[PDB]
Design a protein around this ligand. Structure first.
Ligand SMILES: [Zn+2]
Ligand SMILES: [Zn+2]
Ligand SMILES: [Zn+2]
Length: 282
């Protein structure tokens, strides 16, 4: 397959048949300083019965971690047990559809690599693997990291694709279910007999970057639309759940994780299928 560049246009030729790809990028910042970036690739394929747009979602959700002493004998580490991302298609009434998305099902690897491949005619192939060793007319790579976390697709329909990236288990084998009758839950406990109430949490170099910094998701969807479609809408929601991991000293440190708070923010984007643009609206 031959491809050639012309700014935001890629002319793709495969066996006498030619298609075009138009790129559009928009960025938005939320009230709580979460970041969302959408890369839309509008495909123009006269040999396909409909219009196809591939959307790459890249974001940053701050961990919101805080460490403070309740007293000399009780310390608290607030941390993001769960990150949630929704891409909602608001135009199913106009028969605009999400026809595929990645990641699929559940992914547990520290590094996530997905691939969205388009074939002339409309065909779509989605892989939870990396590529790009195949001769697809258009392939889009998706990649992010999630040390100590897992990602599950909780919704996968024409109307919505949803992902939960939730804490799984520490390297030492502790999770939110761990309970030792003496030391309680020790998932983020640096030691059982040392440190102060704000000094005895797992050092930063031994915590997931999702806890020390934040989550940098990269997810993907594919939308289709009837040939004449001018505009459609999507909504992207970023959600973070914070928990409070308490350590309390009796004659040793005892650990316990409590629920705390949830923050959800939503950004709206309009797709102009004629001008090949994606713009935040509202
Ligand atoms: Zn077009
Ligand atoms: Zn699927
Ligand atoms: Zn605008």
């Amino acid at each position: 397959i031959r491809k050639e560049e012309n700014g935001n246009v890629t002319i793709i030729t495969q066996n006498n048949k030619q298609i075009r790809k138009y790129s559009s990028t928009d960025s938005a910042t939320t009230k709580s300083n979460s970041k969302i970036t959408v890369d839309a690739s509008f495909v123009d394929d006269k040999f396909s019965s409909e219009m196809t747009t591939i959307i790459s979602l890249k974001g940053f959700i701050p961990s919101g971690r805080k460490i403070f002493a309740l007293s000399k004998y009780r310390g608290v580490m607030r941390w993001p047990i769960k990150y949630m991302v929704d891409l909602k298609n608001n135009s199913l009434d106009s028969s605009v559809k999400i026809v595929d998305s990645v990641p699929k099902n559940t992914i547990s690897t520290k590094e996530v690599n997905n691939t969205i491949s388009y074939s002339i005619g409309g065909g779509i192939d989605t892989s939870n693997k990396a590529s790009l060793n195949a001769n697809y007319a258009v392939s889009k790579s998706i990649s992010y990291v999630q040390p100590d976390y897992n990602t599950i697709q909780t919704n996968d329909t024409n109307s919505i694709a949803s992902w939960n990236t939730e804490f799984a288990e520490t390297r030492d084998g502790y999770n939110v279910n761990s309970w030792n009758i003496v030391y309680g839950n020790q998932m983020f406990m640096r030691s059982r007999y040392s440190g102060t109430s704000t000094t005895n949490f797992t050092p930063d170099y031994q915590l997931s970057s999702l806890i020390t910094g934040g989550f940098s998701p990269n997810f993907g969807v594919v939308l289709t639309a009837p040939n004449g479609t001018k505009k459609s809408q999507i909504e992207i929601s970023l959600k973070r759940e914070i928990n409070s991991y308490h350590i309390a000293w009796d004659t040793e440190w005892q650990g316990r994780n409590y629920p705390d708070s949830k923050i959800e923010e939503t950004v709206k984007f309009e797709l102009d299928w004629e001008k090949h643009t994606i713009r935040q609206i509202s």
